[PDB]
UniProtKB/Swiss-Prot annotation, chain A:
Localization: Cytoplasm
Molecular function per GO: nickel cation binding; unfolded protein binding
Cellular component GO terms held in the UniProt record: cytoplasm
Gene encoding the protein: ureE
The UniProt record lists the keyword Chaperone: yes
One of the GO biological process terms: urea metabolic process
Protein source organism: Helicobacter pylori (strain ATCC 700392 / 26695)
Family per similarity comment: Belongs to the UreE family.
UniProt name for this protein: Urease accessory protein UreE
Main location: cytoplasm
Signal peptide location: none
InterPro entries reported for this sequence: UreE, UreE_C_dom, UreE_N, UreE_N_sf
Keyword DNA-binding: no
Coiled coil residues, start to end: none
Taxonomic path: Bacteria, Pseudomonadati, Campylobacterota, Epsilonproteobacteria, Campylobacterales
This protein's UniProt keywords: Chaperone, Cytoplasm, Nickel, Nickel insertion, Virulence
């Protein structure tokens, strides 16, 4: 149908248990408040949200639940530079330099880790600074973005 | 014309000396070639070989003959002194100031940072609810974040 409100998330499980269909978003499309998708199973779906989370849609956000049938957001993976900073000093240097390049940036899964989309210049930079990183196909979750 | 630094007043120097000072703005500290006039009115030319990549610092000696010194002094300016509460906040503060393209410097303790005053920057900082005080103080080159 024409979805206006999130119905929670698969994380606050949900043993599934359910027949979950998925909408596949790029990490950059997760901030759309009005749009039309087609689900994995090909259902036609419309979002015009009231009170989208300011951060964007996250993995597992339930768009639809009728009986045992679910539709949920899933974020496609992309190539991502996984930055591992050695100190607080280096954190500020990394963040300030990426912020300068106006690249997107996200919190990693540990204090000194940070994740940005892959872009040749970004990586040139990171290597120039001699910062540790690996490129990986992985998932930029909205809830972990740096506001900006 | 001065081509080489002769160390710094910090590695003292009890003074002891008749120190004249060149007065630079924090943004002028990266000049490699230029002409100044000292505080005492001497005329002085810099064409440096191997300027510190970071800029001239407070107290960098430009000239020493006998007891007479000439040294760099960085004029104080209004500076937002940022005190971040966590590593998380450090990355958000730094990334947002970088975005704004503001200058940024390391403070004197781990979660302290200093940037020129500018209304937007401070608007931002208050918007993020970050702790800061404005103060006339000194942005030393050696503590800049490269870019």
């Amino acid at each position: 149908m024409i979805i206006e409100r999130l119905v929670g998330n698969l994380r606050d499980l949900n043993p599934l248990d359910f027949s979950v269909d998925h909408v596949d978003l790029e990490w950059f499309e997760t901030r759309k408040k009005i749009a039309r998708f087609k689900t994995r199973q090909g259902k036609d779906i419309a979002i015009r949200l009231k009170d989208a989370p300011k951060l964007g849609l996250s993995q597992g956000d339930i768009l639809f639940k009728e009986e045992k049938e679910i539709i949920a957001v899933n974020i496609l993976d992309s190539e991502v530079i996984h930055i591992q900073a050695k100190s607080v000093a280096e954190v500020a240097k990394i963040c300030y330099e990426i912020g300068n390049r106006h690249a997107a940036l996200y919190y990693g899964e540990s204090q000194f880790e940070f994740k940005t989309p892959f872009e040749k210049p970004t990586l040139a930079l990171l290597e120039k600074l001699g910062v540790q990183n690996r490129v990986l196909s992985s998932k930029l979750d909205s809830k972990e973005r740096l506001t900006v």
